[PDB]
Homo-oligomer: 219 residues x 4
């Protein structure tokens, strides 16, 4: 009842990768029921960012995800009060990130409080060298663990030069209100895209498409 | 003289050791390469009854059985008639680790599979030695090139009795026998594996699996 | 030239968040860098009482307090006057993951510590959220250079109630503030960290640590 | 609690079968050791699959924790498992995806320990240190011993020194199990080791291997 077909979103991410502090302001629109959202982002300090913007992109709301009827939608059922997610990103070269987002809503807008942190990215690695092109599309596996909805994902960044950079992520989602029903095992296909940006990535426009499904042969 | 025919046969021998238990499993079955479907009947010839869950073996009993669409290169069907081999490592969240290998070849309408499977470090209280597993959930394997070889990464979950999952992380490497097989670009493979039937000790099992490659969203 | 005195003060502020719970922890201590020893009294200024095992934070409260033999380069004694930073990941066997960083500087007789600590994904019924930890066991860190930076790898174990162990994989990267301080070759550190005393809610903690460097067998 | 019959100068017989990246091999070895001094060594000869297309170094830890100096205050699980013996299973995970599985069955007849080892390795990259044979030595390290899921378990983060002097990381988990009943389980401890190829021929077809291990309690107890 609370979510509408078209909603706004405000976002304030703050973080540190490799000792580098940054703030990023975001403002955007999207269709929760179509699994879509875009948003305009602007680094407000920390720019020029010394690292690849790509590592940030998954960390700027699953509520924007096309859920089919045979699958419980934890995220759209979390609102008004909202929900929180925490995430770790484990890169194949030792680079490790942790993140959190408190997602809230009032009126037509979703509010996202997001903290990002990253450690141990190697000097001549693709992240500090900015050799990343984009996230390749993948599929997140959703399941319950310790009484909590958990998502594991097998993720890859395309690099300059016809090779890929592995990332492995675990997310833990918690609805704020008591009583929200945990879903069964499902899978969530997603694509993420930087549609436009300036040369140093101080201002970027980002797009996310997400759809949930029960996998083969039901997808 | 096309190598891949619409209805083909599968001949399999697996020999292995998990936690120091030796075993031999012979397989016979069939499948439809272009539809990405296969089924086979397995018979434990040595080492029955198996002390561990049969489920840990079932990915190791052929990606030639995957429905590839036009716009994605099919390494597997292009690997024939000479064939290919794969190597896989399976890392479970409780420390059990398996490695396996299959050299697969082809004569006429039949694929031959010479498979080896080794496991160690499964705890006695774990869902594997307790034979507490139910099925592999559906999952998506990521295909991409690493050091000039086709590589596949997958995070799979084994559903357990009692409404719980058991995580396995798997990496496989596929190498065509013949020189000059064109490697595919990055893509996804969806799959499902289902034990369709089994006798009480799992000495005789009917297995079925379906694989479909694709390019992820938006495209389907 | 190092300007490390044989008795030094230690001043520290830690700020952070584990599983959404934000805490601030102030420390005051002293140490003897040349025999590898330091102890500090902590008190949590924000976030008391902490909902999680205090022992996970304990690693994060300076390898100058390590005993280095003459035959091994002491990167940490040599990073001063200017100081140094370290970054560190802590991956626990049940999916809990922490990152931490410290910027260490020296003003006279006192080392100053800016520490941030963030922890994610601890399961509600794991040893951390239920406070079933007893101590870190004594272990050994592997120091070596990777990509131009002193790196320390170690697998640690936190003793649990009943004498079970909880396993933590840690990686730290240490960076001298000033350019062209020299790189040690492969060596080992031994460490022990012991919580000496604490009140009921671990809001006042008194922590001791001992660390010595060596080159391993047969030298030792 | 029980006379080991381990006599302070003992022999070692060993047969190994393996496969790494699809290459089959058999290595034999005869050796000697001093179990109470935690020192041992062996002459190995590659009997099949020679010359090996991979770094010999990956195999060297698979060729017995009986040869480890245990001080009185730490339970020695290995010498107490004799005369009957014991077995281990081990997984080796390298930072670039190389994964290995190894197991050994140790028995004792009279003066001689007998080892049946299996070793299998998978997914070593073509231009990695292993396949390109660019390893030099294992650095000294320290394994942590503790009971896990009821079984004596050894964890260790090792590193192979490589040509060009970078290191190549490997993470090992070993499980040890006595053949007979009644063997006491140690408390947590540490075991230092150092392994060294003493001498070898061009193709690593004949190799001389030595190791030294001593168990201890960490700090500041050592
Ligand atoms: O290039 S695709 O991700 O639109
Ligand atoms: O894999 S299907 O048959 O569940
Ligand atoms: O003599 S020892 O260093 O192998």
């Amino acid at each position: 009842s609370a979510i509408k077909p078209d909603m706004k979103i405000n976002l304030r991410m703050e973080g540190n990768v490799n000792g580098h502090h940054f703030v990023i302001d975001g403002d955007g629109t999207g269709k929760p029921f179509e699994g879509k959202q875009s948003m305009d982002l602007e680094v407000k300090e920390g720019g020029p960012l010394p690292f690849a913007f790509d590592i940030l992109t998954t960390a700027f709301n699953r509520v924007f995800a096309e859920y089919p009827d045979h699958i419980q939608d934890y995220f759209k059922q979390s609102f008004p009060k909202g929900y929180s997610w925490e995430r770790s990103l484990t890169f194949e070269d030792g680079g490790i990130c942790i993140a959190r987002n408190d997602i809230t809503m009032e009126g037509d807008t979703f509010y996202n409080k997001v903290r990002f942190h990253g450690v141990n990215f190697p000097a001549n690695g693709p992240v500090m060298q900015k050799k990343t092109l984009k996230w390749e599309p993948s599929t997140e596996k959703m399941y319950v663990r310790d009484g909590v909805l958990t998502g594991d994902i097998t993720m890859a960044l395309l690099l300059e030069g016809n090779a890929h950079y592995r990332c492995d992520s675990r997310t833990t989602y918690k609805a704020k209100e008591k009583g929200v029903k945990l879903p069964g095992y499902h899978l969530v296909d997603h694509c993420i895209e930087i549609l436009s940006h300036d040369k140093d990535y101080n201002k970027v426009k980002l797009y996310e498409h997400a759809v949930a499904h029960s996998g083969l042969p039901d997808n």
